[PDB]
Design a protein around this ligand. Structure first.
Ligand SMILES: [Cl-]
Ligand SMILES: [Cl-]
Lengths: 648, 648
């Protein structure tokens, strides 16, 4: 029920009744600890409870990373061996600075395709010169990837130190989903070349995808039969193994190493059949064994990469955060965004120093790590060690691995991103603005490539956020019978408007973008054309003044001038959605007050929160003409005051 | 007073008590009339009342436009004669499609400097070749200016037809003020070359202003004494005349033609002293007499100009609208933004066809037109006719006009834009966000030039709008004694929080940018670390389940598990500032509900407006778990329900 009986309360009354009023060691060890979680979570590691699970999880993660690293290195354009380096250099670094215990840092399809586009831009493939140009191009691509990794790591470390871990919140879920779907489309188009076996020119810039698809279609009859057969067999095997594992996941504690088995079988078949020599099927080539000494980044490329560097960084960070947060909700721990950004930046920087390319976290790999029984980053560290073994001696065993098979892996690794079209269609029933953002991001990333596409998508998202506040549901409120609740009359038929009092509510805040829109909507839906009546009144007053001046040389009420008096004697604004009052909002409010006082209508402001009143006071909004007694706290209070003060 | 007694009302009750519920001839003539205001305002023109005033106003406007056109043509890099063409071609066109009576369309400093930058970019000044290269460069600059005018006119007409007259509202007042101040600085730096007489290379791209200033300082000792003396004398005369006119404006019905008198005196003195031959003072040159036949735009430049075309268009439109609206408030008529955009676009297009450069409206010229007694666009048309006379025969009289004098005019014509630094300093007391936008726009336009500077300023303004919603005044509300008004406790000391009930209000809307921020702020200021308590509860429940499973193999309340029970039994959200509910907002609300129901706290939503409920219903927010009875209409109603339903 309700029994609230009180005297009428304005802003001044409300203030009267509410009494308005306005290092060294310890930190040296807190900052060090928060920068290095390892010192806090490794000493308290339960060996008996988690060792075996972490060992099995790391074994599975390494098993899955061995073919994924090579495939994504091939996607990036680099020789496959460097991919393994990723699976070994950032990961261990993430073991030291990482806060998420259930994500595996490594090669991601989107990051790999972004690095591949960069390498193609700064090192196009040329068919004129074959062997020595190929070696020089591989070296140049490796240097470009290392410099890009160094720059991305520096950007991420800098953003993390300034605690700019909230930059991900600008990337809404529809935008990220569209970007990932377009990245999957890009990856499929790029891998079509390796699946068919065609030789194609390196396209770059806008509309690269369309040109690549057209060239693939044009050169399709030249596709090698053996390469297509091998790619189809590899894809069929991968699909069958993945479906089998999904359909009896409960029986087997760990997923079947389908990708590793496919890679081993392809290598064995190619060795036993001489595919490269006989059927001219492309192979990965020679994989060096050992650790490459660190190489300093080439600063001369900093101008070329920076525009495509920061973007990549952000994208990776975004994905990383998402995974961590998801696993956070699955294990009841907090993942610090800033520390995650710092860890990823340090991993990328150390990789770039040690001949690597930018890395991120993989969803399928993280899910496998969780399922196998992982509970800490130690598992991931174990994975790195296994990759180290592959780097040390088991690297030349994959000399005769068919190349297309790797491409096939990536094609079978884009299931979720292409599944997101289901989400795309589902957005047609929940929010069409999200669907518009999704389609704009998808089209921009397809046409203007990923680097510009993300910028265009972010700018369009911000513009649509601004536009959404420029299209609010203006409501001429009315009183629900025998209540104090005021709701839209056009929506609630039973609601009846108060006689002589109008209440106008805007669902969105009134700032510089929609201040004029708010004023025009108020004047349009107020029932009286305020501008026309004010102009008439001014003209009539000027004519009367001229007549008086002429009479003197020879020798204000609306009813007096014959103008139609508005039905409502008072107007009440419901600025409950108002957040901040800037200069334009204050100007609009003053203009509304002056215009309605000229038409002999007193304006009352109702439901203003704490910051609005303070900002109005600071902006010199209040004066003798506009006192604080008009700034009522509740709409019904203002309606009661207006009914108690009707002008004669 | 208050006497509102009613049963408790939820969303379902409120719906029950409010009954929630969801060409040819004439047109064609209406469209023709609204596109051509002339057919409506010329036939009803009062000859006796307004003819003489319009004639005098047009005479004054032409008097002021004669030197201003030449000065701004010199600023744009074109030969001065083409400037006069502007004062004759767009203006008359604006007489046909114009809706504002009290603004004069012509050459503006910002538009002129933007055209000059474009011409310098597409036709750099070369000192190696002197005469024939000068003629070819002048022809190329004229073609570039004509093509730019055509493209700007097409852009403006297209925007007006789609009724995109609200694109100006993105340009806030601080942004426009900073852009104009930086344009004035640009103009002063550019005119320093003509004032001193130095020969300088054509700088372009970012940091052009700094390089130009450094080169001027480096070559300062080579400045000609005669040119500096003439410029100083012209500036002193202009300042004296302007101050005299301002200080006795009431006595003289029309302003003293200071600029025209200065131009005539400079021409006479140069003729009578042989400044060009003896003192080597620069002169304007030869002014052709007659009308240039129309020249089709060169489409091959469309790629180069488009990036700098649209920008210019918008800027001009912005200024135009402002002036019109101001004069609207001074004469009680409505100026249609779309029709103004169409008129300006048609004027620019016809000028570009007829060898002209983009035009806008001038504030000082419009003020002089208003003061002299103008009441219609006919006055402006009269101005064009006078300029026509100057184009016909009185064009070769200005052969020996000193060039620096024209530059001096522009320097004395930047008084308001440089005065805006007073506004800049005044922004330090009203709104520091506006000051930040002003400084960012000023610096960006100074360094990265006007074309990129405007884009950077707009992007930063949108980003700061988004950020402003990410920093809201989260408030833990409390009840003002013996009232129903709930206000911030940290701000109002007397306000007391309800025992067992918490109210949380965010001043800004909850959307994808600040949804996580809103949830984290709620959990932080709710007095209980929700995440830690939920994680403990989950761990304790899992341990108990494991113990039960072990017991079975061998053979929910917070108080039961020993966890600390929160002081508040219910939580009430005050989403009065919520405008639209997208997918991320719905996910955040569902997560808040689930998390607080796990901690045994029931969440109630209060003060939701019309669109919020509809969007929640459309998004499948409501289900069996979350009924519509929790969506209370008033905060006090929800508090009463929570107090009437405390769990045992
Ligand atoms: Cl993946
Ligand atoms: Cl001006």
């Amino acid at each position: 029920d309700y029994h609230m009986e009180r005297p009428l309360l304005n802003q001044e009354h409300l203030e009267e009744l509410g009494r308005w009023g306005s290092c060294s060691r310890a930190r040296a060890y807190a900052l060090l600890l928060q920068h290095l979680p390892v010192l806090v979570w490794l000493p308290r590691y339960p060996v008996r409870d988690w060792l075996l699970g972490d060992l099995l999880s790391g074994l599975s993660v390494a098993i899955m990373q061995l073919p994924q690293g090579l495939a994504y290195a091939l996607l990036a354009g680099l020789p496959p061996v460097f991919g393994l380096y990723s699976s070994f250099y950032p990961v261990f670094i993430y073991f030291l600075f990482g806060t998420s215990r259930h994500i595996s840092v490594g090669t991601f399809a989107v990051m790999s395709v972004m690095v591949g586009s960069v390498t193609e831009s700064l090192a196009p493939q040329a068919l004129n010169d074959s062997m020595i140009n190929e070696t020089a191009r591989d070296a140049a691509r490796v240097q470009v990837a290392s410099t890009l990794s160094v720059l991305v790591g520096l950007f991420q470390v800098g953003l993390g130190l300034i605690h700019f871990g909230f930059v991900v919140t600008y990337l809404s879920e529809p935008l990220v989903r569209g970007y990932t779907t377009a990245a999957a489309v890009q990856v499929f188009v790029s891998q079509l070349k390796y699946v068919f076996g065609l030789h194609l020119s390196s396209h770059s810039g806008p509309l690269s995808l369309i040109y690549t698809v057209l060239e693939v279609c044009w050169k399709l009859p030249q596709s090698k039969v053996g390469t297509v057969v091998t790619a189809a067999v590899a894809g069929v095997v991968l699909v069958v193994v993945k479906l089998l594992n999904d359909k009896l996941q409960q029986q087997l504690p760990m997923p079947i190493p389908g990708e590793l088995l496919t890679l081993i079988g392809a290598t064995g078949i190619s060795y036993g059949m001489g595919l490269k020599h006989r059927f001219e099927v492309d192979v990965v080539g020679n994989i060096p064994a050992g650790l490459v000494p660190p190489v300093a980044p080439n600063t001369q490329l900093f101008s070329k990469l920076v525009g495509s560097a920061f973007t990549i960084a952000v994208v990776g960070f975004a994905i990383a955060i998402s995974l961590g947060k998801i696993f956070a909700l699955r294990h009841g721990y907090r993942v610090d965004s800033n520390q995650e950004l710092v860890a990823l930046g340090l991993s990328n920087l150390i990789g770039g120093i040690f001949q690597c390319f930018p890395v991120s976290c993989s969803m399928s790999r993280s899910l496998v790590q969780e399922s196998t029984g992982g509970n800490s980053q130690v598992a991931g560290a174990i994975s790195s060690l296994f990759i180290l073994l592959i780097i040390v001696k088991l690297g030349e065993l994959f000399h005769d691995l068919p190349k297309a098979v790797l491409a096939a892996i990536i094609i079978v690794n884009l299931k979720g991103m292409l599944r997101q079209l289901s989400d795309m269609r589902s957005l047609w029933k929940a929010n069409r603005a999200d669907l518009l953002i999704w389609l704009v991001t998808f089209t921009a990333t397809i046409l203007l490539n990923l680097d510009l596409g993300l910028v265009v998508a972010v700018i369009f998202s911000l513009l649509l956020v601004v536009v959404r506040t420029q299209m609010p549901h203006y409501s001429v409120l009315g009183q629900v019978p025998d209540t104090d609740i005021y709701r839209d009359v056009a929506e609630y038929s039973e609601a009846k408007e108060v006689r002589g009092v109008k209440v106008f509510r805007s669902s969105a805040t009134v700032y510089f973008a929609n201040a004029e829109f708010y004023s025009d909507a108020l004047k349009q839906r107020c029932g009286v054309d305020v501008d026309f009546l004010i102009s008439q009144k001014k003209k009539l007053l000027k004519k009367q003044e001229q007549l008086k001046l002429k009479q003197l040389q020879k020798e204000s009420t609306l009813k007096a001038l014959g103008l139609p008096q508005p039905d409502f004697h008072s107007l009440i604004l419901d600025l409950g959605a108002l957040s901040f009052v800037d200069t334009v909002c204050l100007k609009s409010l003053k203009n509304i007050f002056h215009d309605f006082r000229e038409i002999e209508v007193e304006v009352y402001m109702a439901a203003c929160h704490s910051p609005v009143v303070s900002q109005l006071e600071a902006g010199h909004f209040f004066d003798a003409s506009i006192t604080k007694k008009h700034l009522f706290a509740s709409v019904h209070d203002a309606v009661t005051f207006a009914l108690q003060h009707p002008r004669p």
